[PDB]
Write a protein that binds this ligand. Structure first.
Ligand SMILES: Nc1ncnc2c1ncn2[C@@H]1O[C@H](COP(=O)(O)OP(=O)(O)O)[C@@H](O)[C@H]1O
Ligand SMILES: Nc1ncnc2c1ncn2[C@@H]1O[C@H](COP(=O)(O)OP(=O)(O)O)[C@@H](O)[C@H]1O
Ligand SMILES: [Mg+2]
Lengths: 359, 344
């Protein structure tokens, strides 16, 4: 029937023109809401960085680890907690007292530690560079704090979990995030790729578009696809991760570069997270990176004019994440034992140098 | 025929475009729901972070409010208002750098079109903390006709800060009841004119009350409001002493909320209390050991709440009009000083 089709056409043109109206209306509403969301997120980002600055871009904590059951044969120093920020230690055979942003003790949990870290993940997603260090003498607890164990995972695994939850959430703001992951060791001022068997010469050079930024030539830089992929990469690197004189004396750096793209407004947001399990602080090139790292941190705090980031592999690698608006957290790991007393004091004296430098 | 064919084509295409546009209406509906929810979460987190910043800073808090022209005043000329961000506001005569400050940064600036609820949104955190033993003080400052009373009291159609505090107060309380805390609320209302105090129903002897329910307090609130060019020069104070009790442990929280709608700041011992407030702010900025809290009967009460910290919030109400310009600048330059006060 011609009339049935005709009257259906008329009906469908009505339907059509009214839907175009209910669509145009929705579209305008969606435009203004999106714009207010973007602005609101810039302001949220700003306030967040304000908090970070009010707490200090560079912060230092202490963490005294508990003895293991296999360590009862070892006597502990006498530890005294003057307050949340101040700890003192006494040789069991004149005062050694140290102030920190916060002191963590043997009962302090892995998540207690991560609470200091989680706000900075958001910072990384906001375009700020982050550095998280574990500092201290071999046996003090650097690796347990950074990697941890399956029953109690440390900073890195928790950082990954939070990174995926947050990147997921961001999709609703119109942002899409890449993660570039690189894993390396630094031993005797030479860089090693923890994702490769191959022997190669890796150099630290200026980034193509940012001369203040850096990149490592000939390194395996992975674009993360999903959590399974990143779990595989971390496992692999942990397997090749370091021999007493070399295990104790090699730095480990896990770098997660967050690259965020908002396609509609055509904006980017690049911020990286460097998670560093430092070489032991126990007393040429073997210790170059560590001493230069402490020099650089203190120099930044003293607002020193010129800073020789390139005096060592470590400081040069992390340079773009140390100066300026970058945030640093350093966990000074300490073992509670009398026979470590002298090294525990050396470690904690760096903290004191930091406090003295903050004014 | 050719007409059946042509009509067939027409309906097919129209069915396909109907299906498209309906598909697009669906995607848009979903994306809009998502976007609104995200705008809500982002705003909420923004408010939380802002409150955290104000605490860490521990300055006296300053919010600036520009009131909209009234239906009457629709033919009254306004000066030029520029807003550079959420906390920065500039005003220029409708008619220069050497002349001083025309650009003012505060904790928050409220547009003429700001709801009473938006105002309260950024004050409620301060009120909730009174329950934790702190002395709180919200006070409104500005020339007459700028919106002090409207901001604190409000009108029945859109209630102000003081009214909404009740809701927030009992609501927050009944969650402490869960914790095993017991709260009583002592209330007092008073007025100050020519350095003389009046009970509108430490300080003694003035009418007190122990509150039972929101209605009891809404009532006595109305009663005080009922008894108020002298209201233009009279200060209004409303204190709500919150006294919590736990028997395990034996601790008590004692914290209060003070709500002041000050006299007008316009250029006139008639307006002294106000002048001595100005002097106490000048003193706190000097951070000096002897401070003239006692040179007036308002600064005496606000002395407990003028230690110079983030537990004190000042609204700086301002009129949009050109004939109010000079008064508005004066009000703003003062508010700038207040925002710089941190002492105790
Ligand atoms: N906070 C802690 N709680 C429980 N065990 C810990 C803690 N810190 C370290 N350990 C244990 O003590 C040992 C030394 O830790 P490790 O990270 O190897 O020190 P480092 O890396 O500084 O040499 C590890 O076997 C680890 O399981
Ligand atoms: N934010 C506002 N929105 C709409 N009208 C307002 C607002 N603030 C004040 N008004 C109106 O303007 C007039 C002057 O306000 P008012 O609070 O009496 O000034 P003040 O108390 O500072 O002398 C009032 O009658 C009130 O109705
Ligand atoms: Mg280790």
């Amino acid at each position: 029937m011609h009339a049935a089709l005709s009257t259906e056409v008329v009906h469908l043109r009505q339907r059509t023109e009214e839907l175009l109206r209910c669509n145009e209306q929705q579209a305008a509403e969606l435009e203004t809401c999106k714009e207010q969301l973007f602005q609101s997120n810039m302001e949220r980002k700003e306030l967040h960085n304000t908090v970070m600055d009010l707490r200090d871009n560079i912060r230092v904590f202490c963490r005294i680890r508990p003895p293991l059951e296999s360590e009862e044969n070892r006597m502990c120093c006498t530890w005294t907690y003057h307050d949340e920020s101040t700890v003192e230690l006494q040789s069991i055979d004149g005062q050694q007292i140290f102030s920190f942003d916060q002191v963590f003790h043997p009962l302090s949990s892995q998540s207690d530690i991560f609470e200091m870290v989680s706000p900075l993940i958001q910072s990384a997603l906001d375009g700020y560079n982050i550095c998280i260090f574990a500092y201290g003498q071999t046996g003090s607890g650097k690796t347990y704090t950074m990697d941890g164990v399956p029953e109690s995972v440390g900073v890195i695994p928790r950082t990954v979990d939070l990174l995926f939850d947050s990147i997921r959430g961001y999709r609703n703001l119109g942002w899409e995030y890449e993660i570039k992951a690189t894993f390396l060791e630094i031993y005797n001022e030479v860089l090693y790729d923890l994702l490769s068997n191959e022997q190669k010469d890796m150099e630290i050079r200026m980034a193509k578009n940012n001369k203040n930024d850096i990149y490592v030539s000939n390194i395996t830089e992975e674009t993360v696809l999903d959590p399974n992929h990143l779990r595989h990469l971390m496992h692999t690197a942990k397997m090749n991760r370091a021999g007493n004189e070399r295990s104790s004396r090699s730095h480990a750096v896990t770098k997660l570069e967050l690259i965020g793209r908002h396609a509609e407004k055509q904006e980017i947001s690049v911020g990286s997270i460097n998670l560093v399990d430092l070489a032991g602080s126990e007393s040429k090139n073997i210790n170059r990176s560590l001493s230069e790292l402490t020099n650089v941190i203190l120099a930044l705090l003293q607002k020193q004019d010129h800073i020789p980031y390139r005096n060592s592999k470590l400081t040069h690698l992390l340079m773009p994440s140390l100066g300026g608006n970058s945030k640093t957290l350093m966990f000074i790991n300490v073992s509670p034992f009398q026979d470590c007393f002298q090294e525990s004091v050396k470690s904690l004296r760096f903290a004191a140098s930091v406090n003295s430098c903050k004014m």
